[PDB]
Amino acid sequence: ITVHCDIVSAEAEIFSGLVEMVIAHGALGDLGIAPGHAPLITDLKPGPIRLVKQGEQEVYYISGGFLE
Amino acid sequence: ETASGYIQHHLQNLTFGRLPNGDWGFAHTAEQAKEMGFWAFHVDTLGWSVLLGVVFLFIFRLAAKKATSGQPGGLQNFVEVMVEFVDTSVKDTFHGRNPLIAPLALTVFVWIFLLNLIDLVPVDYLPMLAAKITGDEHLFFRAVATTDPNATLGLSISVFALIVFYSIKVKGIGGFLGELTLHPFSSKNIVVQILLIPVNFLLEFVTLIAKPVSLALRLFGNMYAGELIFILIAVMFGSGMFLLSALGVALNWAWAVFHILIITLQAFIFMMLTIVYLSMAHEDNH
Amino acid sequence: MNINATLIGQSVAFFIFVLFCMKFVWPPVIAALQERQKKIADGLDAANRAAR
Amino acid sequence: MNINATLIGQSVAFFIFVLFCMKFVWPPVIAALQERQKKIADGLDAANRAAR
Amino acid sequence: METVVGLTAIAVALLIGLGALGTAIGFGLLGGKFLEGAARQPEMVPMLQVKMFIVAGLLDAVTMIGVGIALFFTFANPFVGQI
Amino acid sequence: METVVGLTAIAVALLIGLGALGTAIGFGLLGGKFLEGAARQPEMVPMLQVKMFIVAGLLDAVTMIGVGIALFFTFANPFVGQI
Amino acid sequence: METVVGLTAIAVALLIGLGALGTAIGFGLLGGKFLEGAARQPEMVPMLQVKMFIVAGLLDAVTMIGVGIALFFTFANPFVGQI
Amino acid sequence: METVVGLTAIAVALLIGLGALGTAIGFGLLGGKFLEGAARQPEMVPMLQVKMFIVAGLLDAVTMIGVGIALFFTFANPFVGQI
Amino acid sequence: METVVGLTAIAVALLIGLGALGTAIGFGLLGGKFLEGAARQPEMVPMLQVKMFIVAGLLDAVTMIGVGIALFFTFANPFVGQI
Amino acid sequence: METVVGLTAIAVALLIGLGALGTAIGFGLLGGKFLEGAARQPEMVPMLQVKMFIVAGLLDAVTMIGVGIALFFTFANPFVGQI
Amino acid sequence: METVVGLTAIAVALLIGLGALGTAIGFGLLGGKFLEGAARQPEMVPMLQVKMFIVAGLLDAVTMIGVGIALFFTFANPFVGQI
Amino acid sequence: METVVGLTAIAVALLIGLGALGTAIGFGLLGGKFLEGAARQPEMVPMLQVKMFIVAGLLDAVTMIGVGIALFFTFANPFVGQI
Amino acid sequence: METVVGLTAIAVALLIGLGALGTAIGFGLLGGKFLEGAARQPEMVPMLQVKMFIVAGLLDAVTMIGVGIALFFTFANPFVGQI
Amino acid sequence: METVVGLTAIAVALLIGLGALGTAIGFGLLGGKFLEGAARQPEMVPMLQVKMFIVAGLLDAVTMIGVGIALFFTFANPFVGQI
């Protein structure tokens, strides 16, 4: 039902837990990832990452990065 | 006047040449051409192709006499914008130190540019002067010089003669036949290369001959299609019909804006291929 | 003759106009580009030279 | 008669086309031509100030 | 004579129809990459739009030769003159 | 006469049918890229929509000439007169 | 007369058949990018939906003319009156 | 009646055919992107399936008109009645 | 009758053959995106396989109408009755 | 009945020819996607090869019906009996 | 049997020519992906080659029966004995 | 003479129509890659533009021969006179 | 006889023409992927060149059979003796 | 005989026209991938240019046989003397 998501920075952890759906802004287009997706490495745009937990909403502004 | 009658006269060129009995007389029909040899001239075509050629050198005579080497005047500013654009177009293509290519590029581009610029004038206006001067209402006459396949062929065949000449001059007959038979496919042993020599000859000779032919016919095709499409839109009014003449106004108004692409591209393609083709005749491309 | 009569006149004319222009018309105008560019380059050098 | 009306059809189309062209399509070209002359003059003045 | 006149109508239809078919597919291929390039580099749009018109003059070459010859065969006829 | 009249019906079907085929495929190629650009950059859509209509004018240029000639042949007829 | 009537049935088959072929392939190309965009941007789907219908009006334009002319030939044949 | 009836069989084959060809290729293009969306983002699949059926209505619209006319030319005949 | 009969054999070949062509290319396009997506989501393969069959029914819908009508024309030919 | 015979050879040539054309292009598309996945994830090859054979059954289904009908028309021609 | 023997030459040309067109395109699509995979990682080339030959057997299957019956029409013509 | 003259009009329409179709699609493919290459690496442009025009010399080479022989057939028919 | 000999010229044009069409498009697809693979790893190009020649043999295999049969029909026509 | 020379003109148009269509599309695909490789790696251009010609000779191989056979049929028809 969920995948283990970890949001991190060079200084400290930002989030860690279990999520159903992850929406992130990739450099060539956005991604909507769910459990069992084959390996993906991508460069992230500066913007909001939206997480889904068993069907509440959170928003965080990030200055760029990578999604693995 | 009928639509077919309007079109039928305008499609024929003025020819003077060798009749079976001597070097004097004008040709009156297409059928008459089968007895005739190589020796004739299109009198309308030579006058018009030479006229704008003199005008290009005349604009340089006018411009060189008044060059400031400082602040440009109102008229020469417009000429500098055209020269700066042409110089930029040559610089964005040629990086070498050959002295023949640059004056050739300027001459070819500006001559084709002026010959193409006159395509906006009515087809029926220019023929009437030649007819009245000759005293013949049946005189065949075409003004537009770049819409004759011989004009584009004269430019591509002469450039091709320089390309082939420089290739044979530096590599010799034995080396030239070697390039034409041992490339692009090659072998370490003779028995395999002998099966490839006819294939190599079939590839290199055909591709070599296709350069002057494609340049002349592509440039002629684009220019002929340019004049022919404008002439056909003009036939709506030429038909004498009320509805077709009334309808033509909307189509003509929308259509008129198009000619600047033909002027820019057709002059540019000859330049772009000429710089490259003359550069590849002094080195091994295989 | 319908189409073939123009093949000889244009070949001679093109080769003549290119060589004639290359020797008596083109060279006098292109020299001005080396000059105009140098008028600005000398002005830019003068600014660095005065400060130095 | 209808034959003369064919010249009228060409004439009305040409006049409105030339008017639309010179009054709305052409002005940006006039601006681009004169503005280049101005940038050249401003550039030459700056080079002349440095020389003095 | 009716067979020459009848076949000229089909000659005109093929000559304009294949030209229209190739032109519509050709500009779909060229224009599709123009919209993608515009989306990748918004600042390059005016340079890409000029380059699209330069390519359009080569793409639309033989099609206009065909349209011209086809329209010529409707108001004039070089085949009927051969009996 | 019947042949000239029968063959001109097929000439009209070729002119409109091949034009319809090309324009439908051409707009599928152009349109697919426009929606891709809209999903990639939603804030650029007002500009990209105008770039699409600039291409749409070139894509249909020869097709509308073909449809115009076809309607001329279906109602009036330049061949029947040639006999 | 059988040749004019018989060739009209084929003209109708070509008008509707080439239009059906073109629109089925055209919407496969257009709609494929709509779904690709919707999977990547599910919250932008109402915008992408309106933009798809705008292109659908251009894609199907000449095919709507072809099917209209085809129906006209089946119920009010204009060629049978020209012989 | 020999010519008109024989050419009507060809017209019916060209109306069901071409339409079948375009619809089979069109669903291959549309369906491939639906599976791409369902493998990139497995959670939007229920909505993506509804959006696929909205496009499927546009894709088969002209093919169904051609199939309707083909059945009409088979169990009735608008041409045989014209003589 | 011989002409009607001969043309009904060609109708049957077009009617089945154009369907064979469209269905083979359609499944080449659909099935290839299923193999790319199955490799993208080995865990979703049981769902992706069912979704492929949802499209497969739409892809073959008109092809099977064509094959059905063609089998009817070869064994119970309606054109032989001048209807 | 001299017109029916020989003309059925064109029917069998279209039935086998259009089937061969579609099946050869369809397996090029399906096969290309199989090798693309196999070269990136050799671990999935045993599963993907089985998925390929499921599609192969649907891809060739209508082509095999066409081939069967073409052989039937070659050795037990049903049209000849209709005179 | 003038017509039957002449239409058989056209049947053979379609069987071999239309099959040759399909395999040349099919192997361009399949072979290009085999080179792409060999370029992705050279250590898997022995494995990818065997998978390419398995697919090549499916791609060429209907074309090899097409040339088989084409040679059966040039020698031992089966239609000239149905008169 | 009539069949030679009428079939020559069709031969001319095919020589040029197929060349128009091929070069419009061919330049759509060559031109589309020029716009993407120029958007991905904008500093390469002057090199890319001259390389495109060199390849354009190969793309229509065999096509210009087809147009040149079609013009020859139109104004100086070689077949007429061969009985 | 004239019809069997005239239809043989068309058979020869289809055999060489369809082979020419398939082979030219096929090597366009295989060769474009040979340049993309050579750019990816310039050190393996000698291997990719030989690997492409073994698939070039498969691509042309049926096309060389087609031109062989066409030259045979041109110089030793087998059908004019079946009469 | 007028039927054999008139069909020879059609045979020639198919030989040159299908070769023109195939080479224009084939070079649109090879030259599109050479410009993509040149844009990605300008240092590789000298080696890529040589490899584009290795495959350019393979696109034209069969189409050159077609134009050679077509010119032979136009200036030295081998079918008229077959009776």
Curated annotation (Swiss-Prot), chain A:
It is found in: Cell inner membrane. Produces ATP from ADP in the presence of a proton gradient across the membrane. It comes from the Bacteria. Belongs to the ATPase epsilon chain family. F-type ATPases have 2 components, CF(1) - the catalytic core - and CF(0) - the membrane proton channel. CF(1) has five subunits: alpha(3), beta(3), gamma(1), delta(1), epsilon(1). CF(0) has three main subunits: a, b and c. This is ATP synthase epsilon chain.
UniProtKB/Swiss-Prot annotation, chain B:
It is a multi-pass membrane protein. InterPro entries: ATP_syn_F0_a_bact/chloroplast, ATP_synth_F0_asu, ATP_synth_F0_asu_AS, F0_ATP_A_sf. The keyword Cytoplasm does not apply. GO terms for biological process: proton motive force-driven plasma membrane ATP synthesis. It is found in: Cell inner membrane. The chain crosses the membrane at residues 40-60, 101-121, 157-177, 190-210, 229-249, 256-276. One of its GO terms (molecular function) is proton-transporting ATP synthase activity, rotational mechanism. Keywords: ATP synthesis, Cell inner membrane, Cell membrane, CF(0), Hydrogen ion transport, Ion transport, Membrane, Transmembrane, Transmembrane helix, Transport. F-type ATPases have 2 components, CF(1) - the catalytic core - and CF(0) - the membrane proton channel. CF(1) has five subunits: alpha(3), beta(3), gamma(1), delta(1), epsilon(1). CF(0) has three main subunits: a(1), b(2) and c(9-12). The alpha and beta chains form an alternating ring which encloses part of the gamma chain. CF(1) is attached to CF(0) by a central stalk formed by the gamma and epsilon chains, while a peripheral stalk is formed by the delta and b chains. This is ATP synthase subunit a.
Swiss-Prot record, chains C, D:
The gene is atpF. Keywords: ATP synthesis, Cell inner membrane, Cell membrane, CF(0), Hydrogen ion transport, Ion transport, Membrane, Transmembrane, Transmembrane helix, Transport. GO terms for molecular function: proton-transporting ATP synthase activity, rotational mechanism; proton-transporting ATPase activity, rotational mechanism. The lineage of its organism: Bacteria, Pseudomonadati, Pseudomonadota, Gammaproteobacteria, Pseudomonadales. It is found in: Cell inner membrane. Belongs to the ATPase B chain family. It comes from Pseudomonas aeruginosa (strain UCBPP-PA14). Its main location: membrane. F(1)F(0) ATP synthase produces ATP from ADP in the presence of a proton or sodium gradient. F-type ATPases consist of two structural domains, F(1) containing the extramembraneous catalytic core and F(0) containing the membrane proton channel, linked together by a central stalk and a peripheral stalk. During catalysis, ATP synthesis in the catalytic domain of F(1) is coupled via a rotary mechanism of the central stalk subunits to proton translocation. This is ATP synthase subunit b. GO terms for cellular component: plasma membrane; proton-transporting ATP synthase complex. The chain crosses the membrane at residues 12-32.
UniProtKB/Swiss-Prot annotation, chains E, F, G, H, I, J, K, L, M, N:
The record marks D60 as: Reversibly protonated during proton transport. It comes from the Bacteria. InterPro entries: ATP_synth_csu_bac/chlpt, ATP_synth_F0_csu, ATP_synth_F0_csu_DDCD_BS, ATP_synth_F0_csu_sf, ATPase_proteolipid_c-like_dom, F/V-ATP_Csub_sf. The keyword Metal-binding does not apply. GO terms for cellular component: plasma membrane; proton-transporting ATP synthase complex; proton-transporting two-sector ATPase complex, proton-transporting domain. One of its GO terms (molecular function) is proton-transporting ATP synthase activity, rotational mechanism. It holds the Pfam family ATP-synt_C. It is a multi-pass membrane protein. It is found in: Cell inner membrane. Its main location: membrane. Gene3D superfamilies: F1F0 ATP synthase subunit C. Coiled coil: none annotated. Keywords: ATP synthesis, Cell inner membrane, Cell membrane, CF(0), Hydrogen ion transport, Ion transport, Lipid-binding, Membrane, Transmembrane, Transmembrane helix, Transport. PROSITE patterns: ATPASE_C. The keyword Nucleotide-binding does not apply. The chain crosses the membrane at residues 10-30, 53-73. NCBIfam families: ATP_synt_c, PRK06876.1. Belongs to the ATPase C chain family. F(1)F(0) ATP synthase produces ATP from ADP in the presence of a proton or sodium gradient. F-type ATPases consist of two structural domains, F(1) containing the extramembraneous catalytic core and F(0) containing the membrane proton channel, linked together by a central stalk and a peripheral stalk. During catalysis, ATP synthesis in the catalytic domain of F(1) is coupled via a rotary mechanism of the central stalk subunits to proton translocation. This is ATP synthase subunit c.
